[PDB]
Amino acid sequence: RIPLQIVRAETELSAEEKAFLNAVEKGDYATVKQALQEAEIYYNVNINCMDPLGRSALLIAIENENLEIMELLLNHSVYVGDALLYAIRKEVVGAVELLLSYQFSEFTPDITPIMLAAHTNNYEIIKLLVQKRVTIPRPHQIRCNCVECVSSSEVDSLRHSRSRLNIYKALASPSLIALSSEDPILTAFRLGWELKELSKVENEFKAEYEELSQQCKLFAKDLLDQARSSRELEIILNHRDDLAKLKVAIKYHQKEFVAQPNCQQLLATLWYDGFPGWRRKHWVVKLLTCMTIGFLFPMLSIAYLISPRSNLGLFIKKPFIKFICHTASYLTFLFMLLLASQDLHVQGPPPTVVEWMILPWVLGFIWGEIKEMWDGGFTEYIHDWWNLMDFAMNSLYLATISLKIVAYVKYNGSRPREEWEMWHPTLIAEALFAISNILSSLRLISLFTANSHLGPLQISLGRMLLDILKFLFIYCLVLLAFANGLNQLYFYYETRAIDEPNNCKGIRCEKQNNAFSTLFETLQSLFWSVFGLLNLYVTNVKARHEFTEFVGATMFGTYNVISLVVLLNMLIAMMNNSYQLIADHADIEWKFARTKLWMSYFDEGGTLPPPFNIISLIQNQHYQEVIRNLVKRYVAAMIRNSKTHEGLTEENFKELKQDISSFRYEVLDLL
Amino acid sequence: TIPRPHQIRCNCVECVSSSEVDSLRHSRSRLNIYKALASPSLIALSSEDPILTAFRLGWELKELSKVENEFKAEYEELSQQCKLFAKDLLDQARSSRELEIILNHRD
Amino acid sequence: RIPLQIVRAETELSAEEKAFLNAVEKGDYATVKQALQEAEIYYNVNINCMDPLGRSALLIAIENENLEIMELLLNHSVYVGDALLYAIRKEVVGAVELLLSYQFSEFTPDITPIMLAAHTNNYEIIKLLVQKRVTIPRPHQIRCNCVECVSSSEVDSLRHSRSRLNIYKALASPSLIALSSEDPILTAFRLGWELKELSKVENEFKAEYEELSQQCKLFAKDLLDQARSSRELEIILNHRDDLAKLKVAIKYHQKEFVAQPNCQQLLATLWYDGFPGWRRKHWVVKLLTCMTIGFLFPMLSIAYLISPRSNLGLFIKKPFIKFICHTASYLTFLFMLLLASQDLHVQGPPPTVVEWMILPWVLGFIWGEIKEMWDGGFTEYIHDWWNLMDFAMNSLYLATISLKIVAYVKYNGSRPREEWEMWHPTLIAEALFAISNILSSLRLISLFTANSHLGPLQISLGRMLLDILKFLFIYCLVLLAFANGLNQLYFYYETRAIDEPNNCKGIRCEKQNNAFSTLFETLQSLFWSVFGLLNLYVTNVKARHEFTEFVGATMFGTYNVISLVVLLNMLIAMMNNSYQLIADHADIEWKFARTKLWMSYFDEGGTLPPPFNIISLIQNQHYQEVIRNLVKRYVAAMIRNSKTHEGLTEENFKELKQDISSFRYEVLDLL
Ligand SMILES: CC(C)CCC[C@@H](C)[C@H]1CC[C@H]2[C@@H]3CC=C4C[C@@H](OC(=O)CCC(=O)O)CC[C@]4(C)[C@H]3CC[C@]12C
Ligand SMILES: CC(C)CCC[C@@H](C)[C@H]1CC[C@H]2[C@@H]3CC=C4C[C@@H](OC(=O)CCC(=O)O)CC[C@]4(C)[C@H]3CC[C@]12C
Ligand SMILES: [Ca+2]
Ligand SMILES: [Ca+2]
Ligand SMILES: [Zn+2]
Ligand SMILES: [Zn+2]
Ligand SMILES: [Zn+2]
């Protein structure tokens, strides 16, 4: 048998005292008042005493919203401490007003009434608390190293982190940003960015800072949603302290704000500037118009170069026409690169007619990249992540040009390629040119963003490449390990190239040999084993060492089982799990990326596609009025949605029970 | 009375003027009209043929969903609501004659 | 502008008449009674009139559960029709009792009060209706062809199907089976089986019959769940009209009833008969005991053959020991089959020592199969779906024996196999023996059911083989189509075997040839193209018909794209979708299959593993008492669970509003 007792004993209540608390619970005003006036005389019943479940009489009256017993206890001067916070968390405006008019606690000591109101996100109570001059202390920097922060971290790191988290949850309140903020949209933007940075820094408290940042982004989105006219939309988007607030939203990565339908509609009607009725057109006439503009890019470009002030000169300044001209010029560049592959023994030859055409687009690409560098700056250049491969293309083109010039100057004769040197400058130049050709032709992935049916697909690829990168570390570790083992076994039986039937050594021969003789060749062989191009007899030696053969063969088999059966199917399962997490927000992310692509063409800089590129208090007052109407509409909408969602608990049933019982004792008293 | 929405691809002076002056209010007004018209109760009353009315309204809402790219989901859900209303109206039949009168009616 | 009107006009109410219905809605008894006694004199207010929303005064009083206005209207003799059914659907026992004591309708004409009560599944109302002698008409046979059924199908097939569905939904009520049934468990079993058959037949009304069958199975499971002692469990399982009811449940495929924890515990303690403490033992001692019993199967078998009445004779009659002995004998048979592969030029040789051992297990397997046939019967034999491959094994073994005997009798000499005939009886016999070896060795999949970690895996394979079978039709259609096309192109360039370098024709040669010359070889080639074993140069001819080559090559490429890229990934996606639908019920299905495997060993027949197999109203009364206690417990439990689930709608809020308003007019009248 197990004895049961109370190992942590407390102070029990007496019979009359339990009767008093029970009368408070059922709401008998006559009995409670009689007990109070009897206690004032006899000092028998403690009015500030506790209950078995953690509450006192004022707490019971507050949770049961019985304002009349609550004010009776206030008039009898019961203990008051933390009951204000209890009324704040209870969301009872009458209790809040009465306690403003005048041990164990389930609240942290930092909990201030404004902060608990900001947690409860109740606009009424937050505004009544803000009516009095009440202050929230400022959080320090994200990476602050001052003496106060290091002392608070050293003394009690749990209370420091809880205090910072408590401050930021107070500040991220949608009601507390709707009031007491000169610019709620910009405040929500900066607060969301800061909460994202604190989510990145504080690893353990990551999810709560993530959800606070998401709450701020949702608040900004709904505030934009409450607009009701195109002027108000453009006052919001064009406020600066054009499209300044939109550029700020793009800078702070507010994809929910950017992907608003009204903002996307305004961006679309700015994008289709020259064509007012592109929204309602057929597929065939859209394709015909696109090809018609795309076949006239040199005419429009030379029109801009000659006279910007004409029906054709400023026609390319429209964003869609500029995008079509850039795409058409780049596609003609790729067509010429395809034509370039269509005497070959000259050492360091002069450039042909096709390369003589290619050279100005190469110079224009380099000039455009360095012009974007010099104009935008550094962080904006490195943030794009396409400029890395753009730099790779420019570097490979420059290397090809330099090697071609070096070969043309240094060599003159016509020697057949069969006896050329292996590190010949012409060979190096042509290899670099082919690599740059591939990089140029995969640069077209960036144009899938502007299409409706390919943009989310590109977003899904960009989100699953991260998991491919995660898997590549494990696969390369396994590859290095098995390459090391197979080298350590097989590098005694290395054979010269002369002993081979056709003077070829390596896995690229007709008869594959020496697949595990050197570390480079072992890495190549175990890489090509994934696609099945490495035959089985590469695990063979001329000597009769059958045990050596069997250990090498089972090493190869273990590598194949780990890679193709385990790791590849692991990669399939990982990307399949990752795709479902992206399919929900793919539309929003695609709309954000397409907005960035659209705003990339709104500038006057970079207008000419290559190779042609080498040849004020009223605004504040109107914005304040629009935001004031927006805040009123948003508070009304979130009040309506609070009165439309579920919201109901057993609090409501015990509230109705309390009202019925208080009335019951009232009419039993009056009758 | 509810004012009539114009054509899906209408190019008249009133529509182009309303699109140019305030495109948000124009789109909100058209969306508001179509949400009013797609009401199952408002098709159950005031309609000479609720089944055919729901059919044509669902097709039109599908076309406006195809055209209006930004307001796609709401027109999709209105078309789905009209299709569900037609399905439930057919579901409420209680005899094979009524089923065949519904299926064999021609106008 | 669109005009709005009422195209289907109805009869509006007058002002006093709307006032009367509004007074009924708010529950003013004084106003309603005054209006009734004024209408009795003046005949100005119609008491049976309709409202704008389809109801009359009695309907409003019934839906608002206001029994006093309802009985007032009953005393004033308002229209009564279908208000009883309205009270049945409303689940108000007072309204039901009062209407029992005494146009447009949303109910079908077949709706009878007992049937609507059975739909509502309210035990109280169903019992009060059953107190009066009330009858439900019998549904006919599933495939009945009588004149009444064919006439009802021809006249109005919608009303006939709705009537049958209405009858079966009435009969499948858990309360209506808990009452008025001599055997609720057997009634639920037969009703679930019948509803499954009607689900199979009625294709359009499939889901509702499926959910009714599932409801009956759940009712039987919960009725078994309400047992509270091992005697009651065994009275339920051992009732017959041992384990007769359990065998009936297995026959009717009640997997939920079979997979009950108490039933599985009783089956386990019958299964581990000889070992009382196998439940609490270590893995190593379990493995040691299993190998110890498995190495002694001939000793236990010969002990049973010599003397069944001993410590070793009846030791094999225990189910676990019998299962271990069968498994050990069959594993030794497979070990001998492995040994059989370890002079070869004799035409029709005598059987060797290994085959002379194999022959009695072959005879024992055939004898056991025909004995199971003769004992169990026909449907039980063909239902197992393992007996098909068992028959295949027996037929191949018999064919091997017959061909070996024919070869031994007909041939005597010793000719080397290089010049044997291609259809030689020895060659045919050895091919059939190898095929039977594979079938014998994959017969071990059936033993994965008895294991804890492999049984659900076998269930998942058995459920995804259906989708593989579904996909195989499409793949074989594509295979036949592309084989036909490639034959029609390539059968002009068929070459003889002599013209080949090594006198070999077909895709099984060193140099693959003639892959699309005949239909059989084209089917083989396009089958082997799936696994990559068919090289690319099989699409080549000796002549210089390059267009012919290109069309053949692009046909091969189109087939590879359809098969490996589209169809194989389709199969992967289909099985991945199918696995998630099986992972939920895999435990229940595995427990059912393991119960079937356990009951297969409970019989005295088939005790000896091969080759050794060729060498009474008190029961009804106790069952009735146990079922009566079970029904009382189940009704109490489902009443408690009805008072524990959500169950609450705006009906409850308008009920409380009606009570408050009726009281309000009452006290305004009394004061
Ligand atoms: C991949 C196969 C078919 C070979 C063809 C290669 C290229 C000639 C293709 C592949 C990707 C194509 C691009 C994919 C997407 C677009 C966006 C498209 O713009 C839209 O979606 C129209 C609406 C809008 O811009 O608002 C204009 C054509 C373009 C650049 C396409 C131009 C032609 C490209 C470069
Ligand atoms: C597959 C590899 C490891 C080669 C070995 C082949 C056979 C020797 C294996 C494969 C499947 C095995 C069987 C899989 C499952 C079981 C059930 C197992 O029983 C239990 O799970 C114990 C608990 C119980 O029976 O209640 C007894 C051994 C047995 C027949 C195994 C016996 C050994 C088998 C035939
Ligand atoms: Ca760039
Ligand atoms: Ca059998
Ligand atoms: Zn600091
Ligand atoms: Zn118009
Ligand atoms: Zn009949």
Side-chain angles (χ1 to χ4, degrees), chain C residues 16 50 76 88 118 181 403 411 424 507:
Chain C
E16 65 183 1
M50 262 285 277
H76 279 75
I88 297 313
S181 296
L403 267 295
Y411 289 74
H424 199 276
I507 61 182

Side-chain angles (χ1 to χ4, degrees), chain A residues 140 144 146 148-149:
Chain A
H140 285 195
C144 183
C146 85
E148 190 276 331
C149 294

